[PDB]
Amino acid sequence: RLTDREAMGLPETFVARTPVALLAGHEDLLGAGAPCLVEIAEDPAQPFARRHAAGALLGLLGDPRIRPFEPAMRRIEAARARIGLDPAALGRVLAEWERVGVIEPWIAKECPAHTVELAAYALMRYPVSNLEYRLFLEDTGSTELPSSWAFGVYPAERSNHPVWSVSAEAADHYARWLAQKTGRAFRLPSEAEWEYAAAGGAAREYPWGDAFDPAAANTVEAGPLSTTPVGIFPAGRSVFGIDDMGGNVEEYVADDYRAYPGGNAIDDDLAVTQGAYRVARGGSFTRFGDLARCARRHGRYQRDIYAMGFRLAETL
Amino acid sequence: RLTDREAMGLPETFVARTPVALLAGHEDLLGAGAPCLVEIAEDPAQPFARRHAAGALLGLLGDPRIRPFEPAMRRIEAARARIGLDPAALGRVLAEWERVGVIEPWIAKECPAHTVELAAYALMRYPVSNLEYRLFLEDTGSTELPSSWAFGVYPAERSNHPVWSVSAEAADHYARWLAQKTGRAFRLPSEAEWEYAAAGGAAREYPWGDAFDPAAANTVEAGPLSTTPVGIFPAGRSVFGIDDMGGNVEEYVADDYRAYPGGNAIDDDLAVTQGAYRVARGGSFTRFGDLARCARRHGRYQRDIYAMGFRLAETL
Ligand SMILES: [Ca+2]
Ligand SMILES: [Ca+2]
Numbered sequence: 001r002l003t004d005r006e007a008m009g010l011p012e013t014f015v016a017r018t019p020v021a022l023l024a025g026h027e028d029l030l031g032a033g034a035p036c037l038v039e040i041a042e043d044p045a046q047p048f049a050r051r052h053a054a055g056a057l058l059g060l061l062g063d064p065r066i067r068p069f070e071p072a073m074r075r076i077e078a079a080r081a082r083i084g085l086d087p088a089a090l091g092r093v094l095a096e097w098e099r100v101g102v103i104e105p106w107i108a109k110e111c112p113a114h115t116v117e118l119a120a121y122a123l124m125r126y127p128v129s130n131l132e133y134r135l136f137l138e139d140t141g142s143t144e145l146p147s148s149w150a151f152g153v154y155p156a157e158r159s160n161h162p163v164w165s166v167s168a169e170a171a172d173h174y175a176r177w178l179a180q181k182t183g184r185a186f187r188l189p190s191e192a193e194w195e196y197a198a199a200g201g202a203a204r205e206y207p208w209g210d211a212f213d214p215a216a217a218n219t220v221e222a223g224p225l226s227t228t229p230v231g232i233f234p235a236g237r238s239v240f241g242i243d244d245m246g247g248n249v250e251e252y253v254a255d256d257y258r259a260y261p262g263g264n265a266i267d268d269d270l271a272v273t274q275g276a277y278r279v280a281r282g283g284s285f286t287r288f289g290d291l292a293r294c295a296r297r298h299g300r301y302q303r304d305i306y307a308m309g310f311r312l313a314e315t316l
Numbered sequence: 317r318l319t320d321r322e323a324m325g326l327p328e329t330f331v332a333r334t335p336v337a338l339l340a341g342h343e344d345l346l347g348a349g350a351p352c353l354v355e356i357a358e359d360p361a362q363p364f365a366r367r368h369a370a371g372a373l374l375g376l377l378g379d380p381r382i383r384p385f386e387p388a389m390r391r392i393e394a395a396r397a398r399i400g401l402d403p404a405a406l407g408r409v410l411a412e413w414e415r416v417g418v419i420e421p422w423i424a425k426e427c428p429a430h431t432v433e434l435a436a437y438a439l440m441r442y443p444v445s446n447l448e449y450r451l452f453l454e455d456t457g458s459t460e461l462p463s464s465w466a467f468g469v470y471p472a473e474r475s476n477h478p479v480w481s482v483s484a485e486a487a488d489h490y491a492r493w494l495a496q497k498t499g500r501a502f503r504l505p506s507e508a509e510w511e512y513a514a515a516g517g518a519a520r521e522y523p524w525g526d527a528f529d530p531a532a533a534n535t536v537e538a539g540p541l542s543t544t545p546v547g548i549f550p551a552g553r554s555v556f557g558i559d560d561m562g563g564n565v566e567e568y569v570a571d572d573y574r575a576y577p578g579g580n581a582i583d584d585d586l587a588v589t590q591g592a593y594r595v596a597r598g599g600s601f602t603r604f605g606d607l608a609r610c611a612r613r614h615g616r617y618q619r620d621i622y623a624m625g626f627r628l629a630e631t632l
Binding site: 004005008010012013014015016018019020021022023024027030031053056057059060061062063131134135137138141142143145148150151152153154155156157158159224225226286304305 | 320321324326328329330331332334335336337338339340343346347369372373375376377378379447450451453454457458459461464466467468469470471472473474475540541542602620621
């Protein structure tokens, strides 16, 4: 029933969260050099507008943080991961997020918290970028063009933003292409690999800790209402050094939707949702912080406001 | 029946007409300074990629060519303008453009060529930009948000590109707002004022001369497949010094569609088109060079690939 803007908490009148000119008053960045721009973009003490300005200039220059054939990876040692939500903690999540429309069944599918054995793996520090996805398209001849590319056209000023929306099978295809190109075991992360990389062995509610922080991720509460250059919300980095797990774009995993086994809570929608879509995790610039919860499971519907991107894992 | 990409002459596979990073190899522009960037962006001898790079950097910095409350204007003296198409020249237009789908009735509504007395007037050198339109939205509280702004959000990296698509009445509203702000007689140009400003007293077929030139304007034949910073196709400037009249975005005029009087050619669609839409002129980054003809009359249908912007005139 809601318009896109209503769903994003915005009025019908115009709202801006960025300057009219991103580098106005930040002209010292022109002489900084790319290594200095990278430090500024990833420094949590720098105001967002200056990090955004640095990231935007890197987007024009060619961002050296994005190396398509040797992407920045973080190693994660084998572990007994705890995945999902304790049924006794559902009430707290609902009180926390009912204001934005969350209802009990959406959170109940995170139950029960359970153990998953993970072998050692690596995960991309950043989500896959527009520039990376373009190289994939040009090498493969794929017709899997991103929905946000107007008329299928590459948005060059946003070279270092995450790509969206693509299908889960296009994300799969990107991973197979890079695996073949590099000889490395690239793939999408499993749902358990994604959640553990965000939450750690401490099972944090968010990548950054126990309480939502609108400055730690690009979400709709206070984000700029578009994607951002990867990695310019450093306060939201996970314990393993992964950036943008909360916010920016939702991220596909390898798993199609399934109920977690052992959950005595009746899900009357399972008769149509089981195996019906690929799980997406992490939330996005258009949605609220409930989606930046490490345990939140999403992906059921295709909508303009659901920005679907991805990041790769690697078998070690 | 055609997809957007089919209508643009593009395959299903990916096509790029820009570098992956607009300023890669153009890093000398970082130290140029805005006046030098402006000279580069508007120099027809500079390769398009370097002009685009300069314009993109100006878009980040704040483009000094765009002065919202004192927009760059060109004065045009009172004249007896010749508007439209001689019926004897219709066959030549059809042979020239039938390959892109143009058929006789679309061109026949330009007939007959006729005389319009114009008093002295001024016309904006550039189409109205994203940055200018944002200032309008923030001052008025208007809900007339541009269609290309995803979820209604300002695209800050494209601050100095033309705004699109807006309704003709939103263009009217912008003109009234600026008139009230500045005390100057701003308005949209009449259809005759627009065509004369493009074609001159010589009644050139295109602003730049008699033959189509894919490098003189941002059209779909060879343009970058998005809007461009205003004024970076200087080879297409009109005899009066107006930029981007061919290409970039279509431009509304003050006139609703009417047949030119005196045209003995039967238009069976007049029974539904008369007064039914606002005329748009000049063509765009998504369409072919037939629309960059000074006499071509457009605007009948609302479609994603029809990018509708505007520029202001001023009574002198
Ligand atoms: Ca994310
Ligand atoms: Ca134009």
